[PDB]
């Protein structure tokens, strides 16, 4: 029920309308990642780098297993039971993630019976047969580099240089890995980690994982860019150095009776200066309610907005009254900079501030003039079929609305300042004035 006609004279031009949709209904798949390469074909002069690498990796892998063992002990079948007294402190998300973790024990146990086969793989991507009907994929961290570069060149240079190269490669891999799985991973129980972060254990090549898993969705790019694909760790092995990860593939669903409206701001002239209006740019309307939204966490597309969560927030009553046609309740700010927009196009109709920009009609070769009592001008083909703004020639349509648009004015609100130090100064001044008024009242 927005009043676009009144909002236009303030400098707010309507834009594109978009839909609102959120993810739901995930599916599940399991993968295995191996964090140690196979050096069987170059083992003669590998030195002692592997033992040091193992010692470094064990101290990183241990805390994750220690944190995971907490929920393993106190969850048992009974539609599952937990010992609340032993856990002590927890949140709803942690409890839900613990239930989800418990649901994967059967699959983890079935997978764990192939330890000997897992430990013998020597390729970057290997396909294993878990059962007669199900298969499991195994990925190795640095097998490709060893298979491609180090082994063929082993007989042309002294292999102390090969030892140094292998040590440097392992150190670089550890340096890249330490960012995600380090001390920052305080709570591995939750399932909010994206697949992009998880792929750092494979060198950041999540495209290979996604292609191998065989995605079969048309919204794949939108799901990937909106951070709607997540993963969870369900098992850690400290003797074979591998982990098991479960991946979730959700489905996007569209909310009914909801849309988002966009506004384009244009500067306007009131007394002798340029002003702009401070109002939200994106407005969420569902059913018959108006509220704000933080679109910074969402993905903006041409036709719809994709979010992995509901980001609605309340809105003040004065802003709601301002959006409905009460222009005298809408704040404005002074313009000091020179790089501000001064015209916009909407449905073939042109809104421009001709005080600070040239305006002449190309058809009749005459200038367009703005008086001091007007904030903006509406230009259509009723008066000027073709207009020129500097170095551009534009053809215009017909305006749908009041025929007396340029002959009627509106009211304006109070000026404001939006700087932090200015906010503090204004608060101090208002408090001092209120204190003086209270003293006089006493």
């Amino acid at each position, epitope marked *: 029920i927005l009043h676009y006609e009144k909002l236009s004279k303030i400098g707010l031009v309507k834009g594109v309308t978009r839909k609102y949709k959120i993810k739901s209904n995930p599916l599940t798949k399991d993968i295995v990642i191996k964090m140690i390469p196979n050096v069987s*074909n170059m083992s003669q*002069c590998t030195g002692s780098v592997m033992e040091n690498y193992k010692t470094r990796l064990n101290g990183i892998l241990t805390p994750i297993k220690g944190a995971l063992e907490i929920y393993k002990n106190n969850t048992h079948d009974c539609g599952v039971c937990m010992a609340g007294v032993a856990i002590g402190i927890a949140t709803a998300a942690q409890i839900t993630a613990g239930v989800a973790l418990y649901e994967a024990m059967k699959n983890a146990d079935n997978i764990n019976k192939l330890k000997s086969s897992i430990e013998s793989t020597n390729e970057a991507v290997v396909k294993l047969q878990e059962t007669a009907e199900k298969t499991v994929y195994v990925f190795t961290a640095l097998q490709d580099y060893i298979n491609t570069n180090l082994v063929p060149t082993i007989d042309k240079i002294p292999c102390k240089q090969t030892e140094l190269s292998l040590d440097l490669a392992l150190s670089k891999y550890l340096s890249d890995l330490l960012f995600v799985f380090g001390p920052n991973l305080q709570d591995p129980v939750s399932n909010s980690m994206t697949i992009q972060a998880i792929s750092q254990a494979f060198g950041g090549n999540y495209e290979t994982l996604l292609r191998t898993l065989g995605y079969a969705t048309e919204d794949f790019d939108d799901l990937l860019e909106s951070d709607s694909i997540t993963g969870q760790i369900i098992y850690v092995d400290l003797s074979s150095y591998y982990i098991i990860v479960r991946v979730y593939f959700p489905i996007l669903t569209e909310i009914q009776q909801a849309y988002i409206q966009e506004l384009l701001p244009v500067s306007f002239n009131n007394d002798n200066s340029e002003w702009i209006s401070i109002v939200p740019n994106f407005i969420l309307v569902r059913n018959t309610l108006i509220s704000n939204i933080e679109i910074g966490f969402c993905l903006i597309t041409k036709r719809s907005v994709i979010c992995n969560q509901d980001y609605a927030t309340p809105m003040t009553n004065n802003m709601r009254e301002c959006l409905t046609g009460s222009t005298e309740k809408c704040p404005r700010e002074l313009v000091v900079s020179s790089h501000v927009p001064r015209f916009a196009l909407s449905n073939g109709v042109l809104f421009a501030n001709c005080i600070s920009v040239t305006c002449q009609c190309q058809t009749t070769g005459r200038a367009i003039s703005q008086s001091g009592e007007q904030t903006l001008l509406m230009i259509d083909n009723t008066t000027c079929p073709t207009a020129v703004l500097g170095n551009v020639i534009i053809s215009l349509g017909k305006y749908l609305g009041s025929v007396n648009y340029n002959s009627e004015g509106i009211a304006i609100g109070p000026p404001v300042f939006t700087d932090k130090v200015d906010i503090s100064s204004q608060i101090s001044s208002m408090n001092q004035s209120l204190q003086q008024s209270k003293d006089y009242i006493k």
Partner: antibody
Amino acid sequence: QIQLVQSGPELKKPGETVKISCKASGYTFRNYGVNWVKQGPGKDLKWMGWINTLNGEPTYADDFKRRFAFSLETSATTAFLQINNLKNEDTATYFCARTFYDGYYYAMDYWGQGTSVTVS
Amino acid sequence: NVLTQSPTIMAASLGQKVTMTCSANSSVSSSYLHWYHQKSGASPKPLIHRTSNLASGVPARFIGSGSGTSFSLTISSVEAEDDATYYCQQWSGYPFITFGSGTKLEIK
């Protein structure tokens, strides 16, 4: 199949020299190393050292730094062991083994049949 | 790092279970211990490659366990061909290789 064959028994008088060979077949010779193990009287087992089959650089234990030397013949895939200045305590049985390593653990998967040396 | 085996000789009857021990002068990681066996007139062959992991082709009647400086080997049911000599070995790098004293098994 993988097989290691050594030379036969030999007898020598103190002050002489001895040379023992170890033939390999059935696998890629350059991909694995060779170890030497001594089994003296009393059935004790002691480790002497190993030789790299790529460069030919030998390595000796603390108790075998003086009178022992290793050599290699890549063309015939044969390894040699030579002892100088023989004495009475050298009477024992020697073994040429193989080294296996894949990143998890070390192992001596295949052994020779052994050679007996007697000093009198 | 001297490794000492307590049973110098042991006799057993068919079907009986036996246990051997393997001590260590200092602490040894569980990933560096192996077991070997040798019959008369033959070269040694691997039997167990870790504290518990069996080698290829070894019957499942051999059980190994231990931690710290004390380790042990257990046979659930002896047979006629188990009359060999067993050794405990530690290998934590090329210079650090040590063998045990060995234990001989007899059948009544």
